[PDB]
């Protein structure tokens, strides 16, 4: 039962250690998401100011 009970521990520990990385992904998303969503609004804005200069 030793090798088994140890193996299950190591395995479940590794999986849990992987899920920590999964969580690490989950954590770094919303911020980056806002940052990303910010972009199209600016380029869609700067493109407008350019049109202003060109019309000027």
């Amino acid at each position: 039962s030793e090798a088994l009970q140890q193996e299950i521990a190591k395995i479940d520990e590794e999986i849990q250690k992987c899920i920590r990385d999964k969580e690490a992904v989950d954590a770094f998303l919303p911020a980056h998401g806002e940052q990303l969503a910010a972009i199209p609004t600016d380029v869609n804005f700067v493109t407008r100011k350019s049109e202003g200069a060109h019309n000027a």
Binding site: D21, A24, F28, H32, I39, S50
Partner: protein, 97 residues
């Protein structure tokens, strides 16, 4: 059938690619004439590679192997690294305008 499921689960949660079950491909853009390069590596099934190249969104795109979570983290890392470059260039444009 017990020590098979266990080994298969140990195989699923792993970067060795024995049916990793975290197999998704992301297309990285690369201008010609660099398409002939890339060129997978250690444990790439030409099946998956070609099947990725098959449903290609647009030319000059090469698929990229995302096995599990550190890879998607890395993809994010790049995405930020380019985020900042984008904002910078955009601000340059803004300033010149």
């Amino acid at each position: 059938p017990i020590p098979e499921q266990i080994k298969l689960i140990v195989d699923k949660w792993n970067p060795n690619h024995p049916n990793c079950a975290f197999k998704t491909y992301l297309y990285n853009k690369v201008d010609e004439h660099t398409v002939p390069l890339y060129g997978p590596g250690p444990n790439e099934d030409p099946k998956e590679w070609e099947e990725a190249l098959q449903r290609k969104p647009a030319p000059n795109f090469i698929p990229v192997l995302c096995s599990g979570f550190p890879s998607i983290v890395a993809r994010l890392m790049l995405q930020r690294r380019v985020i900042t470059e984008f904002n910078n260039k955009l601000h340059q444009i803004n300033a010149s305008l």
